[PDB]
Amino acid sequence: SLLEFGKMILEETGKLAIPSYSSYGCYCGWGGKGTPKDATDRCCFVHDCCYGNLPDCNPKSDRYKYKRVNGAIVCEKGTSCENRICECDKAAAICFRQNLNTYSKKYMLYPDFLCKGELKC
Amino acid sequence: SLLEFGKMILEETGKLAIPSYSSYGCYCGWGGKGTPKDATDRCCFVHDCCYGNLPDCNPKSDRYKYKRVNGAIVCEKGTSCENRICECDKAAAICFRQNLNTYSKKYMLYPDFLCKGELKC
């Protein structure tokens, strides 16, 4: 859920999930259309597609456990849905951290009309 | 599109394309620089080169059909673009499978900053 995902985000980036990655570009939030605007926005698009491969699961309400071992995120052994959702969240949070150098305020509260079309995954 | 390619990748490798191949090495990802890390990363490099030679097309977004006949992927007859996109995808997905033997978890989540230099197609 956003409780776990928001915690990895804060731990990895020093930023709060809402608002820093909930109103950013075309895909960081609940938007789902258009061409990702930059590297951070691409991390989000990938995260949506990741959740997309899990139609038997519900990421929004599915809570999992993770721990930090040797400085890295470990998704603890759980249900297939818990494991796969944790892995999607871990990947996006590290993606965010890796792209912090190009994170820009320019793309916060980004207008709907500048995001057009479907990119299927 | 990513949807059809992801599906071939799962079928050929038994791995879900996102996240196993979506942050892998220097080329299985959005980027395009440096020496490919290994055989798997080379499949991605070749796949970019293949898409790079389809400028009359929209590889990422355009949908196509394919079948399985006696084990093997068979691209169905669509538009010129569709069949070519399909063949690029089929070659990469088979490449991933052929090199599963040397797939290495240490190249997942690979930072793009460790990838420098243009390597010509």
What angle separates helix A2-13 from helix A80-98, to the nearest 10 degrees?
30
Alpha-carbon distance of B6 to B2, in angstroms, equals 6
Residue type, B98: Q
C-alpha pair distances (Å), A15 with each of A22, A44, B7, B74: 11, 15, 34, 47
Give the type of residue at A38: D
Task: Please say whether the beta carbons of B107 and B25 come within 8 A.
Answer: yes
Whether B99 contacts B39, CB under 8 Å: yes
Task: Quote the CA–CA distance of B18 and B2 in Å, as a whole number.
Answer: 10
Q: Is A91 on the interface with B (CB under 8 A)?
A: yes
Answer whether B111 sits within 8 Å of A98, measured CB to CB.
yes
Domains of chain B: 1-121 (1.20.90.10)
Q: How far apart are CA B61 and CA A112, in angstroms?
A: 20
Cis peptide before B19 (omega within 30 of 0): yes
| Helix B80-98 vs helix B39-52: crossing angle, to nearest 10 | 170
Distance (Å, rounded) from C-alpha A80 to C-alpha A118?
Answer: 29
Task: Dump the DSSP string for B37-97.
Answer: -SHHHHHHHHHHHHHHT-TTS-TTT----EEEETTEEEE----HHHHHHHHHHHHHHHHHH
Min Cα separation B65/chain A (Å): 14
Contacts of A51 (CB under 8 A, 6+ apart): A57, A59, A85, A88
- Which of A44, A95, A97, A99 to mutate: most B Cβ within 10 Å? A95
Method: X-ray
A47 is an active site residue: yes
Interface of B with A in 13-42 (CB under 8 A): 16-19, 22-23, 30
> How far is residue A82's CA from residue A57's CA, in Å, rounded to a whole number?
8
- Terminal CA-to-CA distance of chain A, rounded, Å? 22
Peptide bond into A19 cis (omega under 30): yes
Q: Which residues on B lie below 8 Å from A46 (Cβ)?
A: 18-19, 22-23
Question: Using a CB-CB distance cutoff of 8 angstroms, which residues of chain A are in contact with residue B18?
Answer: 46, 49-50, 52-53, 88, 121
**Residue B87 CA, distance from chain mean position:** 11
Contact between B19 and A118 using a beta-carbon 8 Å cutoff: no
Tokens of A119: 């990119």
CA-based nearest residue to B36, from B47, B91, B10: B47
**Within B53-79, where are the H helices?**
none
- CB contact set of A70 (below 8 Å; sequence gap of 6+): none
Cβ(A76)–Cβ(A66) under 8 Å? yes
In which residue are the tokens 């944790």 written?
Answer: A86
Provide the CB-side half-sphere exposure for A48 (13 A, CA).
24
Q: Could you write out the DSSP letters of every residue in A76-102?
A: -S--HHHHHHHHHHHHHHHHHHHTGGG
Cβ burial of B45 (10 Å; 0-12, 13-18, 19+) is buried
CA B64 to chain centre: 16
Paired with B68 in beta bridges are B73
Q: Where are the alpha helices (DSSP H) in A1-121?
A: 2-13, 17-20, 39-52, 80-98
Distance in angstroms between the alpha carbons of the first and the last residue of chain B? 22
CB-based contact A49 B18, cutoff 8 Å:
yes
Resolution (A): 2.0
- Residue type for position A51: Y
